[PDB]
Structure formats: C-alpha cells, structure tokens
Amino acid sequence: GPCYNPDAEYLPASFKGFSFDADSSDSDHGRNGAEAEFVFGERTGYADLGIKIKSYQLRARFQTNDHIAQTNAFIAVLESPGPGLLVHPTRGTVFAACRSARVTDSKVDAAGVTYVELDFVEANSVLSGFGLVGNLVALALAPIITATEGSFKRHFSPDNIRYYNTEAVVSTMAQAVTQVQNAYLAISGNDTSQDKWTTVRDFRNVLIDEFTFYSPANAWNVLRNGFAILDAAATGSDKFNVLRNLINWSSTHSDLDGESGDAENAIFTAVRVLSAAYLAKAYTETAATTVNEGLTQYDLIAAVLEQEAQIAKDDCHDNEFFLQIRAFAVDVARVMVNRAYNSPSLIVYAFPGTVHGLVAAWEIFGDAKRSRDLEARNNGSPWAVGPKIISERV
C-alpha cells in the first residue's frame, strides 16, 4: 500500500524477555503423510500422519556504539536452559527454543554492525511420565464392587443372628444366587461350548450344598463371580431386560427384625447395587440412538443409585457406603452424559419439507449408502423422513 506504516504493523521481536530488532522472519509449516505407489498400478494413495513441527528463522541486527555488549547479553540469554517465549514479528507470541545462533562480526570490512542468524523451533511443553491421558469413555466397576463387598460383609453374619432366623436368611441368599443363575441361563441360550457346560455344573454344585452360604466369604465370592459370569455372556442390549428384572427382584425390604432384617437387607442391597453398576456398564457398551434416549437411560440408573444411597443413609446405617455410592453415581453421571451427548455428535438437520431417505443421506453426507443410518434414529416412512432429521455431525 501507499501509506503502510511498517513498524506500526510488525511486532517488535523479543525472545525470553530480551528485546531486539529483527531483519527477517520465516516459518516452516507443513503436513506430513505417507505416499502409496502400488506396483503395476495406475493409482496412488496418501495417508495423513500428523503435524509437521514448526520452525522459525530470524536475522537480528545490532548497529549501535555498544553493539558488542548487546550481542554478548543476547548470547548469554540465548544459551539459557529450557525453551522460552518468543515474539515472532509476524506470528505473535509462541514458545520456542533456540537451536543455532551464528554471530557474524567483521572489523576491517564492516565495523560497527553485528549480525545474528537465529534458528528457533516450536517447543511445546510436555507432562513428564508417559503423558497418560485419562479414560473418560469407560466405567471402572472395581471401587464400587469393593465398597459393596465391605458393606455386605459388615451386615451379614449368619453365625451372629438369632437361631430361629438363620435358615430364613440363608434361604434368601440362595434365592438371590438362584436368580443370578436363571439370568445367566436365559442370557446365554445358544452357547454350546463346554464352558457353559461347566458353569452350569458349578452353579448347581454351589446351590445344592448346605454349608456354603453360612459364611460371608463364600456367599460374597459366589455373588460377585455370578455377576461377572452373567456379564461376560452377552454384549449390550441383550443384557438389558435380564438385568432390569434383577433390579426389580431386589427392590423389596425385609420383615425380620434387628440383625436378621439387616442381613437380608444387606443381601438385597448388594444385588441391587451390583445390578445397577452392571446395567450402567451394559448401557455404555451400546451406541445412543437419540440424545433423549441416552439421557433417559442415565436418569433410570441415577435414580436407582440415589434410592440406594438414601437407603444406606437412613439412620446412619453405614456412612461409608453412602459416600461410596455417591462417588460411583457422579462417575456414572459423567460417563452416561458424555455418551448421550458426544459419543456420536447428533445434530438435528432442518430440511425444507419431508424427503426420501436416500436423498437426505446423500445431501447430508455425500454418501447415500448411509441411508441405513438414518432409520434407527428417525421415525417416519422410508419415502418421507423429516422435515427435521436427526443424524451425526459431518
């Protein structure tokens, strides 16, 4: 332009606090990938592998009666340990580390001026260790199961309850294990491998025995292992109805009094909390078809967990299990909410008037074969979907 003020448009350069005047400004951006050249073929491939590390190159000048002292100070600054903040005249503030600094300084040819050729590299911080990001795509069911073990073994001792109630309590325990067994037998179905053939025999050998459930250790091991085997039998939706029935079975309360009722209620609470946890893990294993659907599933599970916490807090039964349930509830909240809102980023496209499935898919994505995807979320005849169409982000 004709009225372009340079020094009112270029930023005064400085590195790591020390300011200086720059004479040039470069950059080395890029995008690195592979290049496929299949033999005997008239075709070529490419694969984007990441970001090419940025590098800046400058040229500083020193033309002053004390340029020697300025250059010495600048050398002392550039050799400081660790990367620091750089003000590139045309890219603003970055974090770079000096990599080379040639200092040209002649006498019988040009005395008075000193030039420095500088070479910086984008140096981003790190996090010592293995820079291990979190895991907020998945539930960890170990802490809640340990807390359930604690709260179960605290209130269950069929050797410390009145003699006219031990048989009743133990029969209730065996009935719970029978429920878990029926759940597994209904969820496996057409599993022919001998592993079922054994697991069934193990369930029967545990149930037929008489002195197995008179010990809290054996009872808890049987319960946890039964739930784990029921988990490992199917994936996702298949384990919904089954688990929801279990939540209903253990939604009752005990009529015995004193310690006996506390033991039976410990049984029921263990079953209900383990079922809620494993139903959360089941919900997470399958993709949300609609934001309202994922949020409704989370509402169900959070309601169950809050009900259990209120039960475990009623007259200071155990404060500790209340706190544990509260923590697991906030964890299931973060995971289920992230699943409902962000697993596929569902958006509501607004079409003018209702349209076919193929046309809608092709206009949204540019790929009509994805029409099958628009049917699981939208209700409406295949030839008239809309005029508002839920789908994934692009």
Binding site: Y349, A350, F351, P352, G353, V355, L358, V359, A360, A361, W362, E363, I364, G366, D367, A368, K369
Partner: protein, 176 residues
Amino acid sequence: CTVDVADRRKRFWTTQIAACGTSSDDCGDCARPGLQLMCNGQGQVTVSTDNYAVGLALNILLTDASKADTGCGWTPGNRGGFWGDSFRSDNLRSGSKIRQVPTRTSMRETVSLIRAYALDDLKKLVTYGVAKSVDVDLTYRGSNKIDMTVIIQGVDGNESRVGLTGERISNAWVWS
C-alpha cells in the same frame, strides 16, 4: 454360427432433441427435449432408441452437478447432483456445471469460463467410452448471445481401419 457378426447388445430409450417440440418465447425457439414415441401399424407405441451419443450429451448438459462447498452453505435440497452416484464404480459425478459460472464483467472472460466448464463436462463422453474427440466451438461475445456448436466424433460398428494410435472406444456398439 456364421450369422454371429451382429451383437446381441441392444440400446435402451434415448433422450432426443426437439422430442416434445419447440417453445417460442419471443426471444427465439428452444428445443424442449424428451422421449420420442414411435407408433406402429396397429397401435403399439414404442420409445425410440436412436442417437445414443447425443442422448448422453443431452443427459450431461441438462442436469445440474453438485455445487462447491461455500462458507454460506446450501439449502438441504438445493445442493445439486444425483444420489445414484453413490453406487457407481468409476469414481465420477453426474451432470454438468455450466449454470454455476461465477458471472463477471468483461464477457470475454465469461466466454472462456463457460468453454472450460462445457469441455470439462463433455469429456465424460470420452471417459465413458462413447465418443473419441468431442469438442466445442464456443465463439461470440455480442450483448449476451453465445453460439456453442458441439461435435461428437464417432466410429462404426466394425473395425475397418488398422494401425490407429488410440484404442477403439469401449462402447463402439452404440455406433457413436
């Protein structure tokens, strides 16, 4: 046996120039192409199947291709094209984009732009294997009038020439 020399391959319906008659509008006479119905001795109408290459050229010129991605966006239903392109295997699009020229002053530049677009779109005739040297002769500037004669170079159904540089079109059975 010896009868063989005649391909059992047939041709489907073909769109034709002035199939539905001209349409005067005081600016001139257009063509209004469509499908030609050929009658018989005793009722029994039938769609015509002649001029295959010109049929493809009309199918190409007179159908809008996909628009280019702008920051403004397009209405979900206005972005042109055909969903049937999601299933072809030749990795191409269907239609032309002569009606998507970014109009500008100095109509010579507009003429050059329309030439480039028409030639890029009609090259699909050669790419499909129906013609060999399609070419346009768009030449005028007027006020807005423009003449765009098109030549579709074809072959015959029997290779009568030996030692050619190229390679017989793959669909020389339409007679191009």
